[PDB]
């Protein structure tokens, strides 16, 4: 198996960290984890889209 992102679920920027809640391909919601942005830099455009969308939804 590999670390395959199926869907970005949520995002928080607190505690000196930028974290994304991710849904893993081949796994269920019981396996959702929060991962640092540094470790997801290979999906930079997916993260950028989620950053803008969650910024507009919060506003």
């Amino acid at each position: 198996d590999v670390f395959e992102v199926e869907k970005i679920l949520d995002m928080k920027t607190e505690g000196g960290k930028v974290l994304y809640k991710v849904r893993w391909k081949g796994y269920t919601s019981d396996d959702d984890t929060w991962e640092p942005e540094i470790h997801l830099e290979d999906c930079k455009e997916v993260l950028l889209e989620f950053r803008k969308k969650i910024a507009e939804n919060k506003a």
Partner: nanobody
Framework: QVQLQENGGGLVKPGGSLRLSCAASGFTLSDYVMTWVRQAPGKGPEWVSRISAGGSTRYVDSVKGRFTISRDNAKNTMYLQMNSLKPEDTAVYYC?????????????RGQGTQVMVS
């Protein structure tokens, strides 16, 4: 300074068990993607299991259902529980500190510990 030291190896009969540890200092394990790697004599390096900063784990297919990776955040130590060991599991096992979920590339690795199944 960043340090990684492995232990727990040794000689074990086929079907036995070993619990490897990877003690870290100079950094926090939960801030990195940690990987167990092994290299048998005469073969190339191959990753065995990884644990994400968030605690998500994945195993190579040849060890699925036999190996279990975990980390004690209060110890800053990573563990690799090896059950139902086979002669093909003979290798030097070493932990590696990565920062990418999609590559196993690392910056720091330990010196490794020997596992001999015989």
């Amino acid at each position: 300074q960043v340090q990684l030291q492995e232990n727990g190896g040794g000689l074990v009969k086929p079907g036995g068990s070993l619990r490897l540890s990877c003690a870290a200092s100079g950094f926090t394990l939960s801030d990195y993607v940690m990987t167990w790697v092994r290299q048998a004599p005469g073969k190339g390096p191959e990753w065995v299991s990884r644990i994400s900063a968030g605690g998500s784990t994945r195993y190579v297919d040849s060890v699925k259902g036999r190996f279990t990776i975990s980390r004690d955040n209060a110890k800053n130590t990573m563990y690799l529980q090896m059950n139902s060991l086979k002669p093909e599991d003979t290798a030097v096992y070493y932990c590696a500190r990565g920062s990418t979920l999609f590559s196993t590339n690392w910056d720091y690795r330990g010196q490794g510990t020997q596992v001999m199944v015989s």
